[PDB]
Each structure stands twice: as C-alpha cells, then as structure tokens.
Structure 1
C-alpha cells in the first residue's frame, strides 16, 4: 500500500470528483496530515453523530433524558429506517433513537431526534455555539443527501468535522458519561464494515460513523487506535463523481489500509 496522501490523491484520480482527508492526533489535536482540509463536502449521515452530541448536551443540561420514550406514526417514516420501522407500536427511547441513528444510520430516528432539539437550525446553532462556525445542517433526512444544491447547505469540511468530533469526544463540553456514551454508540457501528473497519488489525479500537449520498457521495468519521484505545481522528469525504457504491467503498478501504500501514 502506498503513502496515505498519495493513495488519497490516487483515489481522486480514479473516482473523479473530490476526496477530502484529515488525520488528527487525539491527545494533542494537532493536524498530522491532510488533503483539501478546508473544502466543503456533504456531511450525509455522518451528521448523526453531531446530532446525538446535541442531544447529550441537553441531557447534561437537564433538559432531556435518554430513557424518555418517544412514540411515532407510520406517517413519520422516511426511507432507510431499519430500526424505527419495527417499533411503531412500542416506540423508542431517546437513547435507543441515538443508537439506531448512529449504529444503523436510521433516518427516521435522526428526524425524531432533530425534532427534540428544534430542527436542523438548532443543530447548526449548537455547533456554532461550541466553536464550529463552518458545519451547517439545513435539511432533514432524506433530503440532506442531495450533495448539491443548494449549494453549501448540509456541508462540513474535513478539518471542521474532525475538530468538532474531537471536542465532542474528549472536550469538557459533554460530561464524562456523555462523551463515553457518544463514543460507545460509534464503537457499536453496524454498517461501516466495508470501510475503515475492513483494514483494521486485530486488537485495534475503532468508533466510527459512515454516510452515503447522491452524486457519488460517501464519507466516514472515526476515532481509532492500536491496543484497544483510540489515539487519532480520521475524516474522509468524497463527492461529485459517478462512482458506484462498491468503488467508493474500495477507495475508502484502501485509504484506510494505507493510513494503518503507515501509522
């Protein structure tokens, strides 16, 4: 496997569109390497981690409980809701909704959680308020996956997302319990098998969240490291090609193989 930045540029060569990449040291926050760090990419389902950050912040502020059961109708269901579609009678707790949104990419679960915080506008305010003046959520699922227009809506940058993820996971913004719950959900991710996880050696820790959108869009955010503990943050986004799902998966896995090999 080639050097990581070479592999990233190669992925872009093969896919077309743009590929963005950043690797951060978790302990220090220092940027180790990057490519297109400050360019915008659609967040796609990766936003669901930030959403649950906002939910946990409200729990920490005594405004929400993870045990609170939410009921909803079949009319609330949108595409890609593999968990929520199974609980129309019994409903789901806020904590269960976050697990579904993060670990299964459940869209209705995300929408229901957005409602609890006051919508995409309030998620953006939450981000602005913790120091992220770049990332913006403008739409609900499943419209936010349009990857254009309109036009910088529903976007982040690799460095914005990486910095914000780091603050959520290790900063004093959330309580220790809440930081732990957020990473626990990400560690339990069920649908990112073919991505960074495919290149992960035995004994390593990974907590991640993937996403997919229109116009060749794919992405992953991760905290990972050897010896069962995370030590670096990795964010990879891609958009603006006609690449099939399999090919986009392959390039991300190959970037992963590279950054592990050249750790």
Structure 2
C-alpha cells in the first residue's frame, strides 16, 4: 500500500540509512509493494534459513539425515552460541543444529551446518542451481556480518531473497515434509520479538528470521498472514545507520504496523 511506502521512506530519514522492502503474494509470486528491490544489503543471520533449505534438499536426496549426531570441540565455538556451548561432550543432531541456527540464531550451529554441505561456496552453488544468481555467501560466522559499504560478499537483494524464500516454502524444490519442517523452525523463531512480531495481532501466522550486523545492519524475512495461515512474504533490510539497536527495532516494527493496518 502507498502508506507503507511513506513509512519505509520515513524509516530512511530516522535511521539516516538505506532501507530495502518487498511484499510478495505467497501463492502467485506477484510483487505487491517494493522499495530499492534490486539494491544489495548484507543478509546477516537471515542466510541461516537458506542454509537449512540446502540441508533439507540433501535429506530429500538421501545425502543427509535429521538424526545424524555431530561432535565438535571448544575451538569450534564462536560468539553467541547459547545452544552449541552446552553440548561439547554429547554433540547435536542435524535436526537440533537447524533448530538452534533458525530459532535461537546460534552462530556455531550455522558454521557446523556449513561444514556439512562444503562451506559458503556450496550454499552459493545450491542458490545458483534453483535460479537465484544474486544471493551469495562468501564467509563464515562471524566475519559474514562485516557489512563493508559496497562489498557484495554475503549480500542479497530484497526481490531475490523474497523469491528464494517463496520457492523454499511453497515450490516442488523441497518435499512436503521438508517445506513443513523449514516453516516450523521459522514459526518457533525466539529472537525476533521486537520486529514484525510486536505489530502482529493474535490470530495471525508469522514464520520469520531476523538479522543484525556491523554498521547498523538489521533485517527480517517472513511468511505471515491472517486467520492462522501465511499468505505473504515480507523482506526488510537496512545497513549504514548509527542509530541504537532499540531505534532500528522500532522502525522495522512501525513498517510492520503499517503493513498490517493496510493489509
């Protein structure tokens, strides 16, 4: 809606930074609203949904199992590993690692899952293979969050990320069971509370993944809709702001309130 576009531009003003925005119809793929849809932004922890999509694709092909147990050491742990830091002696299943990467944004869990598929360049190959020639991962946690201005490493465009999320959640790309598992992890997201979830009324469905990086980078990808079912994809990215985490949270929440109000 035009008034959501007014609020996206007001968010640029308040953050002193670029904001990218797209709304897709989940069913048809049609673009309902866009701002800077083909400019690049750092993905930050939003890549973790694409990573677990690549993992589920391998499970579908008989090349991985949800139940396989992985052992790791102290020296694998990076900053913010609230689940993985508790399982040094017993390890974690692939299932537990995707849950920790998506719902808790555990950084070690994402690194362990990147190891299973052969690193960032194999996530990029998975994406090329399904028709996304824009989205790219180049680095591991934590360096992929550096957000150097004009650096195209570890970036997407709002339009590319929205199309890719749609193909993962509703295509023939994953099996029915794998689609359902990916959206179930995103629905149990525990660390996106002050973003679209704070504007979302009781009775609405949301499956999302949030991201934060250096140089005021912030973002969210989501499947949401009324009556307990998703019917739209929303992608919001910003980078460059000097504003506090609270002020960046508040601007994305206000974009959310406007999207809901003018649904």
- The reply to whether TM is greater than 0.5 is yes
Q: Would the aligned equivalents of 1:121 and 1:138 in 2 still touch at CA under 8 Å?
A: yes
Please report how far the alpha carbon of residue 243 of structure 1 lies from its aligned counterpart in structure 2 after TM superposition.
Answer: 1.4
Q: Would the aligned equivalents of 1:206 and 1:222 in 2 still touch at CA under 8 Å?
A: yes
- Distance (Å, rounded) in 1 between the aligned partners of 2:225 and 2:237: 20
Question: 2:13 corresponds to which residue?
Answer: 13
1:116-146 deviation line (CA, Å, top 9, x unaligned)? 0000000000001000000000000010001
Q: Would the aligned equivalents of 1:124 and 1:137 in 2 still touch at CA under 8 Å?
A: yes
1:64-115 deviation line (CA, Å, top 9, x unaligned)? 0010000100110000111101111111000100000000001000000000
**5+ residue gaps, structure 2:** none
Please report how far the alpha carbon of residue 201 of structure 1 lies from its aligned counterpart in structure 2 after TM superposition.
Answer: 0.6
1:237 aligned counterpart, secondary structure: strand
1:65 aligned counterpart, secondary structure: coil
2:192 aligned counterpart, secondary structure: coil
Q: Would the aligned equivalents of 1:138 and 1:144 in 2 still touch at CA under 8 Å?
A: yes
- Distance (Å, rounded) in 1 between the aligned partners of 2:87 and 2:243: 35
What TM-score, normalized by structure 2, do the two folds share? 0.99
Q: Would the aligned equivalents of 1:2 and 1:258 in 2 still touch at CA under 8 Å?
A: no
- Distance (Å, rounded) in 1 between the aligned partners of 2:189 and 2:35: 26
2:115 aligned counterpart, secondary structure: helix
Please report how far the alpha carbon of residue 149 of structure 1 lies from its aligned counterpart in structure 2 after TM superposition.
Answer: 5.8
- Distance (Å, rounded) in 1 between the aligned partners of 2:234 and 2:177: 23
1:4-45 deviation line (CA, Å, top 9, x unaligned)? 110000000110121000000000000000000000000000
Please report how far the alpha carbon of residue 241 of structure 1 lies from its aligned counterpart in structure 2 after TM superposition.
Answer: 1.4
| Aligned pairs for 1:221-260 within 5 A | 221-260=221-260
What TM-score, normalized by structure 1, do the two folds share? 0.99
Please report how far the alpha carbon of residue 150 of structure 1 lies from its aligned counterpart in structure 2 after TM superposition.
Answer: 7.0
Change (3 A) 1:74 1:207: same
- Distance (Å, rounded) in 1 between the aligned partners of 2:260 and 2:149: 35
1:165 aligned counterpart, secondary structure: helix
- Distance (Å, rounded) in 2 between the aligned partners of 1:160 and 1:16: 24
Q: Which runs of 4+ in 1 moved over 3 A?
A: none
The more displaced of 1-10 and 69-78 is: 1-10
Please report how far the alpha carbon of residue 244 of structure 1 lies from its aligned counterpart in structure 2 after TM superposition.
Answer: 1.1
